Write a protein that binds this ligand. Sequence first.
Ligand SMILES: OC[C@H]1O[C@H](OC[C@H]2O[C@H](O)[C@@H](O)[C@@H](O)[C@@H]2O)[C@@H](O)[C@@H](O)[C@@H]1O
Length: 336
Amino acid sequence: SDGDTAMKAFNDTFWDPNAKMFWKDSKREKHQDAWVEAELWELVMDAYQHTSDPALKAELKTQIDDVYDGTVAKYGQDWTNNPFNDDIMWWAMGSARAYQITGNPRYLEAARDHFDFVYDTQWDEEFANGGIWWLNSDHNTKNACINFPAAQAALYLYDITKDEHYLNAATKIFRWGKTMLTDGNGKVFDRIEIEHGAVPDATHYNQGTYIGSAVGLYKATGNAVYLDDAVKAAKFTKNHLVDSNGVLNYEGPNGDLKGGKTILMRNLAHLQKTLDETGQYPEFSAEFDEWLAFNIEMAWSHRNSDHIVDGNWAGQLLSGTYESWSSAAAVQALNG
Ligand SMILES: OC[C@H]1O[C@H](OC[C@H]2O[C@H](O)[C@@H](O)[C@@H](O)[C@@H]2O)[C@@H](O)[C@@H](O)[C@@H]1O
């Protein structure tokens, strides 16, 4: 499949098998930022689940453990001293998924201990009536990029453990986020600041983790309002975070946002599968399938001769240095 081709090319260009980490770009000079590396860990998992090539499937399963080992070799196993609660939570969520795939208890301990550190100590009701702080070093802002991933991590921990504590946490976090970090109609705000108030700037990755948490809560609770919340956020994405031709925006130059389509596509795939299975929202489901397919074909059409796709899916084929986070989005799109 094209998903196999894309993942193999991505590894050929960006994987460092000695450091067991991805390079930040094709010059192979610095390795990827820690939080982004968790998202590339999840890409490896998603390709592992997608492929049928037995040589590839075996390699990807090995790579799931290697990415963790390379990251712990550089950063250590205990992430509770990292001042960024989002970095901690992205790794907690990745570790929960790694537990589901491998059954290795080290991943359950990594997921649960880091989720518990953030939720138990960084959830606060003094500001904004709830929500998790972005940082643990300073308490100034509460952000979509910690809160919705935390709800996702809690849902994975609920599935793993069957402990209602994690469903209760997911529900509490999501409901707060819907109230304080969205417009009620699917637009996810970046954050709320103590000194400046709301910052209602929407981006791909925050639409994505909101959609993923909403789909997961729908499945865990049976409450279809959560599926509606996901549909409204997908409609917002398709109507407002695209160029004049309907292709998902390129969000650079901000380095965190450049590859955000990766997280968005991962979560849109969850919504797509749930709509296909339930037969709910059939008019939107057909429009959504068509728009996703269009976007994926545009992305793949933008590949270079090495089968790598830069994050500016709509643009001219460039030469020179490619970046692993920007380039991950197409790989993700083809492994959904
Ligand atoms: O358009 C949303 C924001 O996009 C950029 O910030 C990216 C991320 O930076 C930090 O990791 C956190 O503040 C995250 O919440 C944020 O998404 C900047 O352009 C910012 O000014 C925009 O508000």
